[PDB]
Write a protein that binds this DNA or RNA. Structure first.
Ligand SMILES: [Mg+2]
Ligand SMILES: [Mg+2]
Ligand SMILES: [Mg+2]
Ligand SMILES: [Mg+2]
Ligand SMILES: [Mg+2]
Ligand SMILES: [Mg+2]
Ligand SMILES: [Mg+2]
Ligand SMILES: [Mg+2]
Ligand SMILES: [Mg+2]
Ligand SMILES: [Mg+2]
Ligand SMILES: [Mg+2]
Ligand SMILES: [Mg+2]
Ligand SMILES: [Mg+2]
Ligand SMILES: [Mg+2]
Ligand SMILES: [Mg+2]
Ligand SMILES: [Mg+2]
Ligand SMILES: [Mg+2]
Ligand SMILES: [Mg+2]
Ligand SMILES: [Mg+2]
Ligand SMILES: [Mg+2]
Ligand SMILES: [Mg+2]
Ligand SMILES: [Mg+2]
Ligand SMILES: [Mg+2]
Ligand SMILES: [Mg+2]
Lengths: 125, 225, 187, 128, 53, 147
RNA sequence: AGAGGGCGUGAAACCGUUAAGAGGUAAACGGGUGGGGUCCGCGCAGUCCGCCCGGAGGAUUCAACCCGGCGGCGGGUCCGGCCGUGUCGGCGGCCCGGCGGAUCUUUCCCGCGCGGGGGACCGUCCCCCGACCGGCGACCGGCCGCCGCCGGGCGCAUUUCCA
RNA sequence: ACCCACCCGACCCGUCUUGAAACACGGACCAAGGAGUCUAACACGUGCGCGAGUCGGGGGCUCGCACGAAAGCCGCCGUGG
RNA sequence: GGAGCGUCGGGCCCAUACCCGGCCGUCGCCGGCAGUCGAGAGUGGACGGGAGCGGCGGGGGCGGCGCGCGCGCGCGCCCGCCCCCGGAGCCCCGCGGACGCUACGCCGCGACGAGUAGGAGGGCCGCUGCGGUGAGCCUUGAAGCCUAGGGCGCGGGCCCGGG
């Protein structure tokens, strides 16, 4: 299920990273990058991921589909939000709120989305 | 449904508030009665002494049922029997104090551990400082400070002692709950006596500080508390 | 300086199972939560016996399970064993059972499912009765191991019935001086 | 301006000197790395007055300020650009540390990517 | 010196056994050699049974 | 794993866990089982009784082929035969009474430990116990010898 | 050759020179400081900003709301079908299924009382529709509620960016 | 963190010992090597699989061996412990 | 005319000893957290009838089994509503429920902390080689070495800056 493969993955995963007292996890769809049971997108039935766009403008949001397990090609769906950033935070908030789609990732996905928003601008003079 | 649950919640909050005010009034009136009993006792002892002196008589006062014992010598170089009696009287450090009721067994234990303790018969204000300033109780085997009457009311609610005033009244006027009150009280970690000790090693009769301070224990309690 | 004898300040009981098996650790997590939430002592005893070792949870036999469950009063009752259920081939008839265990052997499982009983696991037992109602908690023979035949009072000593550590029993390896009244002394 | 941490506590340290090994002043083969004295008659072992002190557990720093830099961050050793997105949600409390074996060609890419992601690097001006 | 309740053991290691240790690392190659000799014998006697009489 | 052995935790310790006053010398009390009657006598008395002395006769050319007599109890008797044989029992209006060949199963003597279920049998064995024969004739079976 | 024919890198013990400090209780060390140096981090003020709100400067578009399409979540009388388990029905596959048996039959066959293949029996694994309990995260096609994305109508008290 | 100055403390480490700074022993200094290992028999505790059974030793069948002298299997699945 | 001797009175000095406070570690808590109102703890609510400012007519006991921050509150008009939190808006939300959850984790109290010979546990201390793993590092400079630089860890040691 989920706790079983968490008990497997929690110490011998390829994305696990020790080295100087913090244990992170570097897989895709792991926002906040923690090696925790809340923040792991590979295991759970419902998965929210926040990534920057490939073109450089906008934020892609990855939603796990639930329509098929054992099928990683159709397991996720990607959408692209490139708007005036208040509608971006509100749209991702409505995605995780109104769809009842695992609300523990909600505010943390808002954090990662708006940090990517501050990333995709000229930073210095 | 929801308005009914709202009115039920307000009823429960009002019930808790009214019961808390009733217990508060109980504590106030029992403290007033304890004040009246203390004034009664301090009056009637002087009354007995005056009516004994009016004729050709003498009022021998009662041996007081309560003593306060302080271990004044440390743990290094201690006899096995004396160490056993000190750990039965809960005196494991230097400068610990306990309230001990008096009978033949207690007097014989204190007289066989005389050279390591200073014990005397304390006073009401001495009990007041030792319980208010040094109020530490044993709740779930933990040395918890007595910052509320609810702690004593939860621990000794089945013994009739539900407040600081009930505990002080039991300890001072020793009754049938002195064992439970003394087991509730952690042994008092008192500080070093301000002003210096006279002499630790010899007895109070020969100029030392060990032994029986049966009236002079109160000055040492004021110095150590 | 305070005079605490620090020899027994650390209680040497089990806090977690020493094994690294993940199904047992998930059962441990579930009964941890049931122990520190439910007011029943059944979940605490189940958690404490999931903590123990393999030589400390003994295998429970099927005929002793039939014996202890045909006691009066325990009709409609389930038998919760925190070890293994082993089959006895020397019992003939077996009634309907409701057995909860970590592991049941194949012959005992076939015998119970042929008699018409039910074999639950511990997660199914927690879904059925979370407080442990309708349960009888059993355990196998603790002193039944051969290792306890060598323990206790020493051999070569009167009124002692301890099996000595002999590499091969026979006529001339023991039963001589120390066991014969003719050869010096016996005990 | 620089990159400020989330909270700036007053880092208190119970001892800031090094626990040197006994007779390392006298001998060159005796290094400064601590070895506990285990002799039957050793001044340092049985703790006489006015000597070197042994490292006990009592010198332990506070858990809120353990492994903390004087700036207010905690180090994280970073080799490549892909390891910079690890500290993307930790930039207010953790800082990147570029390794020694990283070349100067991609070190500039790591520094500019951390500047885009608003992550403090404790050594940006090293190679150039 | 035996102590505190063990077996009264008699190990047979009082000779020069380390000169006469017979290590068995040959034996999978020996199984291969026996297999090759058995297949060569079976190819030698071509209509005859491979086990023998 | 020498990583987990005790010699790693004893680096820095002088006597290596073997004592400062009495050092780990080579053989302090002799080699092997030395000193039977002397200086290990208390050990050889309170932990190995009967270790010294002769008892019993000597059988020079002994072999286990003559004394091989494997024993089976009556409590495990229907285990040697398949389960449908006792399914097809107490039926057919006959008193079917199946035959349990014990030598075919691999035992010679049938002992009398345990409870036997009420079903007639023909136990063919080389040797019998008297208590086993009493239990079989009390159930209603028959003990048949075989060589 | 800062790799020069015992020459890849070239540590420590030891020696020479330069710079700095010091020097009559042998030198050296621990705790607490002070002073002088070599470097590091600022700084021609570093007051660092992250949100929300008010005001005077600007501005491209769109959100509010509808239309069309796509994708996703949740679900009802369980809407219709597959799928799926627990029981019941046809004992129906049992010969249009193999295996195993220390249950019978040599009413049979073959190779000569035996072995194999048949015949019943038992146990183990399957076919068709219908009902109930959990429709069970093992899947769809319609229906409803909601969310997100794309293209238009949305001309400016709304909307968002620089100071 | 480099050096110097002051106040207080401060005898040279390891070992034999009841007791070492010892007028007890080893010891100029530095670099490298350097001392509880391996097999068998046991005993106890622990981890795992199966369970009145368990184990395949040895051998045989599959691949010509890169990985391999690995792995898989056995009317030998029990001759035997 | 003690800085000597004997009996003494005030004040004063400090040990790692005692008291209070800060931090670290160990042990104990039937410890708390997979998500709720609840602090001497001694309930909630459908459902049928009468209907009510009435309510259970119990110890100068000095109190918990009970009363005046409501129980018929308010609105429309004597009768009815007495409603849902996609939101009563609250020190508690029985409607889903972390920022706090590597549950081998996090958090809250209480006590304790000497040590040879010895025993046990944890090492994200260190060396070498192997099976996986890092879309790992590297002639735009690996290992090694030096360092009067920045540091971290109680410590074993480790990460950078320069040559
Ligand atoms: Mg003393
Ligand atoms: Mg100790
Ligand atoms: Mg102990
Ligand atoms: Mg000594
Ligand atoms: Mg052959
Ligand atoms: Mg030691
Ligand atoms: Mg030695
Ligand atoms: Mg040892
Ligand atoms: Mg010895
Ligand atoms: Mg060169
Ligand atoms: Mg070379
Ligand atoms: Mg070269
Ligand atoms: Mg050279
Ligand atoms: Mg000697
Ligand atoms: Mg000694
Ligand atoms: Mg001597
Ligand atoms: Mg010495
Ligand atoms: Mg001398
Ligand atoms: Mg000598
Ligand atoms: Mg010499
Ligand atoms: Mg070396
Ligand atoms: Mg032993
Ligand atoms: Mg074992
Ligand atoms: Mg044998």
């Amino acid at each position: 299920s989920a706790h079983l493969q968490w008990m497997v993955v929690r110490n011998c995963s390829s994305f696990l990273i020790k080295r100087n007292k913090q244990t992170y996890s570097t897989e895709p769809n792991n926002l906040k990058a923690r090696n925790s049971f809340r923040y792991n997108g590979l295991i759970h039935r419902k998965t929210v991921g926040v990534e920057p766009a490939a073109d450089g403008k906008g934020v892609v949001v990855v939603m796990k589909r639930r329509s098929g397990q054992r099928k990683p090609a159709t397991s996720y769906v990607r959408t692209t939000i490139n708007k005036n950033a208040r509608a971006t935070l509100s749209s991702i908030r409505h995605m995780i709120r109104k769809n009842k789609y695992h609300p523990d990732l909600r505010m943390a996905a808002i954090r990662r989305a708006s940090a990517i928003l501050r990333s995709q601008k000229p930073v210095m003079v | 449904n929801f308005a009914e649950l709202k009115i039920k919640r307000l009823r429960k909050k009002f019930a808790q508030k009214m019961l808390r005010k009733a217990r508060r009034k109980l504590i106030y009136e029992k403290a007033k009665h304890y004040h009246k009993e203390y004034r009664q006792m301090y009056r009637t002892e002087i009354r007995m002494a005056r009516m004994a002196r009016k004729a050709g008589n003498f009022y021998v006062p009662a041996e007081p049922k309560l003593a306060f014992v302080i271990r004044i010598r440390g743990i290094n170089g201690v006899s096995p029997k004396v160490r056993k009696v000190l750990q039965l009287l809960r005196l494991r450090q230097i400068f610990n104090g306990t309230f001990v009721k008096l009978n033949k067994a207690s007097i014989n234990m204190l007289r066989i551990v005389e050279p390591y303790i200073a014990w005397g018969y304390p006073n009401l204000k001495s009990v007041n400082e030792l319980i208010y300033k040094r109020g530490y109780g044993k709740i779930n085997k933990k040395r918890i400070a007595l910052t509320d009457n609810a702690l004593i009311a939860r621990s000794l609610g089945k013994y009739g002692i539900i407040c600081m005033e009930d505990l002080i009244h039991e300890i001072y006027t020793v009754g049938k709950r002195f064992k439970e009150a003394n087991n509730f009280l952690w042994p008092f970690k008192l500080s070093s006596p301000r002003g210096g000790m006279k002499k630790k090693t010899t007895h109070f009769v020969e100029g030392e500080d060990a032994g029986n301070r049966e009236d002079q224990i109160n000055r040492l309690i004021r110095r150590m508390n | 300086g305070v005079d605490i004898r620090h020899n027994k300040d650390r209680k040497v009981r089990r806090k977690e199972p020493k094994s690294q098996d993940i199904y047992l650790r998930l059962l441990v997590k579930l009964y941890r939560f049931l122990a520190r939430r439910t007011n029943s002592t059944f979940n605490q005893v189940v958690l404490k016996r999931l903590f123990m070792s393999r030589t400390n949870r003994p295998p429970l036999s099927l005929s002793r399970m039939i014996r202890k469950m045909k006691l009066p009063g325990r009709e409609g009752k389930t038998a919760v064993v925190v070890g293994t259920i082993t089959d006895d081939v020397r019992v003939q008839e077996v009634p309907k059972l409701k057995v909860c265990a970590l592991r049941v052997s194949s012959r005992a499982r076939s015998r119970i499912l042929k008699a018409g009983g039910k074999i639950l696991t511990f997660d199914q037992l927690a879904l059925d009765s979370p407080k442990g109602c309708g349960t009888v908690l059993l355990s196998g023979p603790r002193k039944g191991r051969e290792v306890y035949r060598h323990f206790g009072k020493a051999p070569g000593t009167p009124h002692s019935h301890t099996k000595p550590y002999v590499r091969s029993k026979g006529r001339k390896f023991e039963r001589a001086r120390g066991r014969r009244a003719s050869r010096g002394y016996k005990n | 301006a620089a990159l400020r941490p989330l909270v700036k506590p007053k880092i208190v340290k119970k001892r800031t000197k090094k626990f040197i090994r006994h007779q390392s002043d006298r001998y060159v083969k005796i290094k400064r790395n601590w070895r506990k004295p285990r002799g039957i008659d050793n001044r340092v072992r049985r703790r006489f007055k006015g000597q070197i002190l042994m490292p006990n557990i009592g010198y332990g720093s506070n858990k809120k300020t353990k492994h903390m830099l004087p700036s207010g961050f905690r180090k994280f050793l970073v080799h490549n650009v892909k390891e910079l997105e690890v500290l993307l949600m930790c930039n207010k409390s953790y800082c990147a540390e570029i390794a020694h074996n990283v070349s100067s060609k991609n070190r500039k890419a790591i520094v500019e990517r951390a500047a885009q992601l608003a992550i403090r690097v404790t050594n940006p001006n090293a190679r150039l | 010196a035996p102590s505190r309740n063990g077996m009264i053991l008699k190990p047979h290691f009082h000779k020069d056994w380390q000169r006469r240790v017979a290590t068995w690392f040959n034996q999978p190659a020996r199984k291969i050699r026996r297999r090759k000799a058995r297949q060569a014998r079976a190819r030698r006697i071509a209509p005859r049974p491979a086990s023998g009489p | 794993p020498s990583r987990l052995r005790k010699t790693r935790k004893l680096r820095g310790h002088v006597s290596h866990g073997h004592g400062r006053i009495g050092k780990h010398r080579k053989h302090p009390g002799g080699r092997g089982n030395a000193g039977g009657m002397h200086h290990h006598r208390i050990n050889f008395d309170k932990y190995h009784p009967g270790y010294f002395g002769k008892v019993g006769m000597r059988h020079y050319h002994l072999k286990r082929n003559q004394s091989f007599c494997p024993t089976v109890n009556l409590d495990k008797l229907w285990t040697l035969v398949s389960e449908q044989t006792r399914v097809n029992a107490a039926k057919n209006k006959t008193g079917a009474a199946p035959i349990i060949d014990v030598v075919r199963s691999g035992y010679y003597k049938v002992l009398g430990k345990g409870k036997l279920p009420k079903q007639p049998v023909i136990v063919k064995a080389k040797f019998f116990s008297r208590r086993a024969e009493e239990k079989i004739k009390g159930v209603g079976g028959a003990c048949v010898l075989v060589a």
